[PDB]
Amino acid sequence: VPLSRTVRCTCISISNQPVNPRSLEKLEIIPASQFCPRVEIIATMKKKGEKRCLNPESKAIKNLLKAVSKE
Amino acid sequence: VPLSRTVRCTCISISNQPVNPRSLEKLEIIPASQFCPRVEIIATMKKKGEKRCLNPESKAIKNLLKAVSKEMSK
Numbered sequence: 001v002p003l004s005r006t007v008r009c010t011c012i013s014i015s016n017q018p019v020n021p022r023s024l025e026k027l028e029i030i031p032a033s034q035f036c037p038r039v040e041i042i043a044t045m046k047k048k049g050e051k052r053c054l055n056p057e058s059k060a061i062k063n064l065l066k067a068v069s070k071e
Numbered sequence: 072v073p074l075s076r077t078v079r080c081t082c083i084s085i086s087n088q089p090v091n092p093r094s095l096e097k098l099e100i101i102p103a104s105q106f107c108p109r110v111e112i113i114a115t116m117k118k119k120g121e122k123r124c125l126n127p128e129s130k131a132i133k134n135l136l137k138a139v140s141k142e143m144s145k
Contacts, residue, residue: 026101029139031092039143048072056143068100069110069127069136 008035011042011053018060019043019052021067029056029065080107082124089131092138096120100127112136 010030028042041054041061054061081101097115101107112125112132125132 021102024102025104026099029098029100029143031095031097031139031143033096057145059144062140062144065100065136065140068102069112069133071102071110 004035006036008033009038009040010036011040013053014055015052016055016058016060019054019064021064021071023047024068027064027068076106078106080109080111082111082113085111085124085126087126087129087131090114090125090135092135092142094118095135095139098139 008030023045025044025046028044030036030040030042032039039056041056042051043054043064044051054064094117095114096117099113099115101111101113103109110127112127114123114125115121116123125135127133127136
């Protein structure tokens with residue numbers, strides 16, 4: 001049985017690389033919980049099974065949320 | 072390489088009602104594509120992990136997205 005506090009976390013590292021909105025299949029936002037002490041953001045790209053953990057702290061990411069949510 | 076996939080929007084119905092960010096377990100934003108002409112937002116609620124589609128066009132959801140974007144930065 002895993003330590004419950006972080007059982008759910010799925011990101012181990014982050015990418016500060018600009019994500020091209022037109023390259024996103026979808027964006028997942030996972031608010032912190034009693035199973036993962038931090039907010040995790042995962043972008044699923046359209047090409048070659050790529051996915052990536054994004055910096056929820058960053059603002060460029062916040063502009064991504066707005067874009068992805070509007071178009 | 073692309074996998075076989077759904078070629079239509081995935082939401083049966085979409086909710087216009089306000090949502091308390093606290094009750095959200097997860098949120099996924101799916102941008103419009105040639106498979107579904109509009110953005111879809113699938114919420115996974117903490118209760119029974121019920122999957123509920125949110126209407127990104129509704130004021131309530133636009134508000135939820137804003138509360139989320141804020142309560143996401145120190």
